[PDB]
């Protein structure tokens, strides 16, 4: 609703990850452009680009989302508007999750300070 | 509701973290016992203990939640019931979050595959 009409840029090296995020934002009325790479996100973020936000995966080979953001910010300064850039951390989350299960934990608590989530994590009682 | 009446054990080295989680579970009717340490979680998890679940912080000095879980599982096998053990990953999440902000990202997307969360992360439009 509120992000209806806006143009997001979704950067991830993983096609399934792109597909999920872009379908979610497509649902909310955003129109979405993807990019498989930091190098390509910078190509698409040039001097006059018209993007309203950007969902940037932090774990990519060759150039990770942290560098491609340092670059986007320096791109913007040498061109002087703040492109809001939000990190997609599912790569890190999945890795700690395997690390949990692997020492015999029965799962993890997403959003670890939100009540409804601590409930949702405990259905070893039904 | 569903976890009303059950006895959780909340293991964390951080008093504020303990206070939050235990107050959330206290709200839901659980009665809660804490522990500041892996060593103390194992003391409280002995041969006949009566706990129904356990929220285990993965980052503690001296003995981290991963080891104290390997120990709890070996404690249980040498005593042979599966104590459901859920990991609290806020230590890792906070660290990647600083790592995001520090290269000039405007935030991160919690629960990176849930739609309502990708919306909630974008209020650079209001
Ligand atoms: Ca990735
Ligand atoms: Ca901790």
Author numbering:
A (entry chain A), B (entry chain A): 856 to 935, 949 to 994
Can I see the authors' text?
Perception of cytokinin signaling involves (i) a hormone molecule binding to the CHASE domain, (ii) CRE1 autophosphorylation at a conserved His residue in the HK domain, followed by a phosphorelay to (iii) a conserved Asp residue in the REC domain, (iv) a histidine-containing phosphotransfer protein (HPt), and (v) a response regulator (RR).
Overall, the refined model includes 126 residues, three water molecules, and one calcium cation coordinated by the protein. There is one missing fragment of 13 residues (936–948) in the electron density map. For MtCRE1-REC, the coding sequence of the full intracellular domain (MtCRE1-IC) was cloned and expressed, followed by limited proteolysis with thermolysin. The intracellular domain was digested, leaving only the REC domain that was used for crystallization. In the MtCRE1-REC structure, the coordination sphere of the calcium ion comprises five oxygen atoms, three Oδ atoms from Asp868, Asp912, Asp959, one backbone O from Gln914, and one water molecule.
